[PDB]
Every structure is written in structure tokens, then in C-alpha cells.
């Protein structure tokens, strides 16, 4: 699939509005498993269930354990770039 770079905007009190699965120990990419209605990922309109998150704000998440990916994702603020591909 083609890589897309997608901007998500959120305020600090918000989460990203996604659930993710996967990570290095699981032998699979970080994948979006749910998009939460009204939350930032839904609002931006460019992130979908089944998208792999390859990177966020230039942090490579292709070879990172689940929890470390969660932590990096959870530290992002403001306008946040997702590098994704539908697999």
C-alpha cells in the first residue's frame, strides 16, 4: 500500500482516539484496531482500522515493543504526523 503522512490535531487533555495492537514482541506491526468516535483520529479523517503505524512525528515504530510504542504515542502533543500504510 502507499505510505500516507496524516496530520492529527488534538488538545493535551485528549488521547489520540485510537486503540492499537501489535509490536515487536508480537512479530507484527503496530496496527490501529479501533477509531473512537469524536476523538482526534476520527476527526482528522485519515486514519483507519487496519492501518499500520510506521512512525509518529518521525519516531520509527516499525521495530518497537508494544508498550514503548504506547509511551511514544502518548507523549505527542498538538499537531501530530502519522506515517501509515493500510496493510
Amino acid at each position: 500500500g502507499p505510505i500516507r503522512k496524516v496530520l492529527l490535531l488534538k488538545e493535551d487533555h485528549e488521547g489520540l482516539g485510537i486503540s492499537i495492537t501489535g509490536g515487536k514482541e508480537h512479530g507484527v506491526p503496530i496496527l490501529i484496531s479501533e477509531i473512537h468516535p469524536g476523538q482526534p483520529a476520527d476527526r482528522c479523517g485519515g486514519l483507519h482500522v487496519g492501518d499500520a503505524i510506521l512512525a509518529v512525528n518521525g519516531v520509527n515504530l516499525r521495530d518497537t515493543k508494544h508498550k514503548e510504542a504506547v509511551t511514544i504515542l502518548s507523549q505527542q502533543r498538538g499537531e501530530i504526523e502519522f506515517e501509515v500504510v493500510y496493510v
Binding site: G15, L16, I18, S19, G22, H66, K67, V70
Partner: peptide, 10 residues
């Protein structure tokens, strides 16, 4: 095996 997905809301 424990029946649980690895899934986190973030």
C-alpha cells in the same frame, strides 16, 4: 494460554 489480546487505547 491466557485469552487476551494485546490492545491499548491511546
Amino acid at each position: 494460554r491466557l485469552q487476551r489480546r494485546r490492545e491499548t487505547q491511546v
